[PDB]
Amino acid sequence: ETGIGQRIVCLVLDKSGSMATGNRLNRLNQAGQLFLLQTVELGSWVGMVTFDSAAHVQSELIQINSGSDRDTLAKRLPAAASGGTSICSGLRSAFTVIRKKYPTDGSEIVLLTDGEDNTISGCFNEVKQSGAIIHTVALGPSAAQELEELSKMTGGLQTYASD
Ligand SMILES: [Ca+2]
Ligand SMILES: [Ca+2]
């Protein structure tokens, strides 16, 4: 969080090729819309990051004050799915997006992925040293175990929005 009690949240969104299967991308967008348009509260600082082989910053941290702010972020939800998969590119970039303004300790990630990635241990340390809180939504049924181990090691929640 920010020193005065404002939330810091960075959406981290799996646009990789496996996400074109079934309705994963639709379920990604639906939860991204819900979190953006209804859930996250006034005053919060919110960034957005998509990722395939690598990360693409859809937005730096902007503060939620108007419905404009919500619609802007929501319009940047991934359109289609393509490319390689590297969850760590996104978390690394999330931590960079945050640390342009605030420390990662106490901040929150919202990792929307199907979990089909087996290099996740690659960033365990940095994920630990960040102090961030990685909530995860599993959008497929074949999520790697290190996806769960990301929330477990950071204090974040896990929910499963597949079928
Ligand atoms: Ca607090
Ligand atoms: Ca994938």
Nearest Cα residue to 12 out of 99, 84, 106, 77:
77
Q: How many domains does the chain have?
A: 1
For residue 8, give the ligand nearest its CA: 1
Give the tokens for residue 10.
């960075």
Per DSSP, helices labelled H in the chain are 24-34, 67-75, 87-99, 124-130, 145-154
- Residue-number span of the structural domain to which 30 is assigned: 1-163
For residue 106, give the ligand nearest its CA: 1
Q: How many CB atoms lie within 10 A of CB 13?
A: 26
Q: What is the CA(136)–ligand 2 centre distance, in A?
A: 15
Q: What is the CA(5)–ligand 1 centre distance, in A?
A: 5
Distance of CA 81 to the CA centre of its chain: 16
Q: What is the CA(84)–ligand 1 centre distance, in A?
A: 37
What is the number of H-type helices and E-type strands within the chain?
5, 6
For residue 116, give the ligand nearest its CA: 2
Residue 80, phi then psi, degrees to nearest 5: -125, 175
Distance of CA 9 to the CA centre of its chain: 8
For residue 2, give the ligand nearest its CA: 1
Q: What is the CA(140)–ligand 1 centre distance, in A?
A: 33
8 Å CB contact between 9 and 82 = no
Task: Lay out the sheet containing 158-160: strands in order across.
Answer: 55-63, 45-51, 8-14, 108-113, 133-138, 158-160
* Plot region of 16 (φ>0 → left; ψ -120 to 50 → alpha; else → beta): beta
Q: What is the CA(4)–ligand 1 centre distance, in A?
A: 8
User: What is the SS3 assignment for 62?
Assistant: strand
What experiment produced this structure? X-ray
> For residues 126 and 110, what is the distance between their CA atoms, to the nearest angstrom?
17
Give resolution in angstroms.
2.6
Angle at 51 between CA 135 and CA 90, to 5 degrees: 50
